[PDB]
């Protein structure tokens, strides 16, 4: 009957929020493009409290972590190429002839380099791939670099490695990462088995298109994830149970000559052909791909009803868009992934699929324009050993569904992995009625009001407290300190100098909640209660501040006389 407001600090409550997370690298230097120095060392053992009774709603397609990863990887890519040589004096008209052998793919190009010595003009010979070389005239021998006229071409430093390294994202103080531990999760929906993690699992930022290379696999069955499943033109991420294997080789052996540009800067180019001119023939085991296509078309028939499903190749066009593109060995491959999607299923030649591939050195990454990167050639054969881990399918009318290898920007290459994780902002302050007057972190979040009110200590303890990454981290830490001082000042103005639980003695009106203490301190989670009194939060807070502290302060001011 005689109920009073009591303020509880450290409540296991949260709401959806978007922030910047700290990148952490495995403890395990190589100057790898995604800099190790930027990212903190990983904790030796992660903690994964298995939140019980918590059924949170996840949605891969509205997830700020994916966009944050896109921005972070773009920033790290640009910063890694910042101090490397810029190929400004190489737009010169190139006299090119076909290499005497593929046919016409490699061009023997002569050009006059005018070095910074400025008393010589050196005629030099170099080999360029056909994809990077475009005509400039009706003369069949005069060409230029493909994108050097509308962009500044940055040469990648040969000392930068492109080998994938697992990168974790760890929550800052004041936020939490909730992981969905289900096995057949469909990306968008409620999750029945939720845990809280400080950092995510190892994520290899593999860059590829039409197909996801390396990474985690499904545990129960092949999982097909799409936001709507009927609008079309929405990537149908496919995660597999068993991994096919993309063995890929570039047979040709090449020698890398260097040409001075300025004092301490060099353009690394292709010297001459050693051995015969072969082609890059990626080998995929046909039987295994058969099985994978079966285990995918079954699920697609389940989702799209028993229609005939046809896997077609992508629509024709320029090689960069249409063809699959590895990041293996430091050489950018573009493979004609047509034999893999050439089947009608409804309801015999060879045993290995050989995909031809073309190597390209001048590239435009992240779908940007006006910027371009030159990858210097690698001496010797390149022998990949990748693992088929996922597919990206897109849809296009006689009762047949046409699926094609499609995809999108690199965000869709990480929705396939960060589909079991969500970032949540925690608001530790809450209020509840009591009779008085003046496990791990969120482990009791799904528990009732009673017996969750005994664990605020851990949540209160663990909730709070150079360069571009530096400034972002400084802004994040300052914001966290701000939040913490917001909470502490709210507690101070409420007369709770240092009391996780502080009784107010403000009367508990019956227009907020009419439920009795038994039905308020049991039968409900802190989430349902915080939602319930959401509208009255401002009013209640006002009453805790105005009605008491002021009056209590005046009273104590009047007690010493």
């Amino acid at each position, epitope marked *: 009957e005689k109920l009073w407001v009591t303020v509880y600090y450290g409540v296991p409550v949260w709401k959806d929020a978007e922030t910047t997370l700290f990148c952490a690298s495995d403890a395990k230097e190589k100057h790898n493009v995604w800099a190790t120095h930027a990212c903190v060392p990983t904790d030796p053992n992660p903690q994964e409290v298995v939140l019980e*009774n918590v*059924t*949170e*709603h996840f949605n891969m397609w509205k997830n700020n972590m994916v966009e944050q990863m896109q921005t972070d990887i773009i920033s790290l890519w640009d910063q890694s190429l910042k101090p490397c040589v810029k190929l400004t004096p190489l737009c010169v008209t190139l006299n090119c002839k076909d290499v005497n052998a593929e046919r016409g793919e490699i061009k023997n190009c002569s050009f006059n380099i005018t070095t910074e010595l400025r008393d010589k003009v050196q005629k030099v010979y170099a080999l360029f791939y056909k994809l990077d070389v475009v005509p400039i005239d009706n003369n069949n021998t005069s060409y230029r670099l493909i994108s050097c006229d509308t962009s500044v071409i940055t040469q990648a430093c040969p000392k930068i490695s492109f080998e994938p390294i697992p990168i974790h994202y760890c929550a800052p103080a004041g936020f939490a990462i909730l992981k969905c531990n289900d096995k057949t999760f469909n990306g968008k*929906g*409620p*999750c*029945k088995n939720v845990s809280t993690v400080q950092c995510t699992h190892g994520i290899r930022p593999v860059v590829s298109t039409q197909l996801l290379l390396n990474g985690s696999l499904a545990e129960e069955e092949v999982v097909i994830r799409s936001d709507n499943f009927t609008n079309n033109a929405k990537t149908i991420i496919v995660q597999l149970k068993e991994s096919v294997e993309i063995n890929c080789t570039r047979p040709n052996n090449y020698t890398r000559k260097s040409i001075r540009i300025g004092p301490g800067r060099a353009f690394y180019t292709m010297g001459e052909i050693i051995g015969d001119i072969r082609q890059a023939h990626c080998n995929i085991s046909r039987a295994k791909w058969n099985d994978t296509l079966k285990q995918i078309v079954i699920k697609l028939r389940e989702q799209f009803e028993n229609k005939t499903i046809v896997f077609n190749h992508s629509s024709g066009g320029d090689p960069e868009i249409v063809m699959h593109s590895f990041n293996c060995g430091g050489e950018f491959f573009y493979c004609n992934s047509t034999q893999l999607f050439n089947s009608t299923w409804n309801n015999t030649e060879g045993n290995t699929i050989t995909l031809p591939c073309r190597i390209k050195q001048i590239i435009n990454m992240w779908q940007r324009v006006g910027q371009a990167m030159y990858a210097p050639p690698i001496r010797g054969q390149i022998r990949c050993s990748s693992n088929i881990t996922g597919l990206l399918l897109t849809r296009d009318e006689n009762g047949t569904e046409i699926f094609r290898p499609g995809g999108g920007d690199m965000r869709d290459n990480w929705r396939s992995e960060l589909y079991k994780y969500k970032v949540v902002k925690i608001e530790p302050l809450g209020v509840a009625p009591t009779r008085c007057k003046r496990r791990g972190f969120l482990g009791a979040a799904g528990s*009732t009001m*009673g*017996a969750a009110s005994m664990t605020l200590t851990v949540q209160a303890r663990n909730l709070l407290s150079l360069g571009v990454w530096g400034i972002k981290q400084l802004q994040a830490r300052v914001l966290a300190v701000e939040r913490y001082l917001r909470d502490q000042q709210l507690l101070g103005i409420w007369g709770c100098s240092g009391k996780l639980i502080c009784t107010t003695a403000v009367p508990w009106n019956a227009s907020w909640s009419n439920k009795s203490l*038994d*039905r308020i*301190w*049991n*039968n409900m989670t802190w*989430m*349902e209660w915080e939602r319930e009194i959401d509208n009255y939060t401002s009013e209640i807070y006002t009453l805790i501040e105005e009605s008491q502290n002021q009056q209590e302060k005046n009273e104590q001011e009047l007690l010493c006389l």
Partner: nanobody, 129 residues
């Protein structure tokens, strides 16, 4: 919250029966579900309660070797509701077991009154003749 049970059934003595309870609009996992039977000649009595969270069971002393209770796993439909099901099977029917079997959702998750039945279904008419 709603609890829906299957229709009436008629059986002979010595047979066995299983009756199913389907739950919508409330979290099946949180609350204990318990079975109460309305006898024709004696009035209502308590059968027992089951806790899906741990699968724990407690039965009245007269029916240890007569009834066994089991439960389904909840399928979430939103953050704070889920659909689910329970099953209780009785072996060896006699004429005295004719009556109306009711489900009931428990009152509270914790506190002094967690065990009590609160929210009831329509009742299933079991006839033994």
């Amino acid at each position: 919250g709603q609890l829906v049970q299957s229709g009436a059934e008629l059986k002979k003595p010595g047979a066995s029966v299983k009756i199913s309870c389907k739950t919508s609009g409330y979290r099946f996992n949180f609350y204990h579900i318990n079975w109460i039977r309305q006898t024709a000649g004696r009035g209502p009595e308590w059968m027992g309660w089951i806790s899906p969270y741990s699968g724990d069971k407690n039965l009245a002393p007269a029916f240890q070797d007569r009834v066994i209770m089991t439960t389904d796993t909840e399928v979430p439909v939103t953050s704070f509701t889920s659909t689910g099901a329970a099953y209780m099977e009785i072996r060896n029917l006699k004429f005295d077991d004719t009556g109306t079997y009711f489900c009931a959702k428990g009152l509270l998750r914790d506190g002094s009154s967690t065990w009590l039945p609160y929210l009831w279904g329509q009742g299933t008419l079991l006839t033994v003749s």
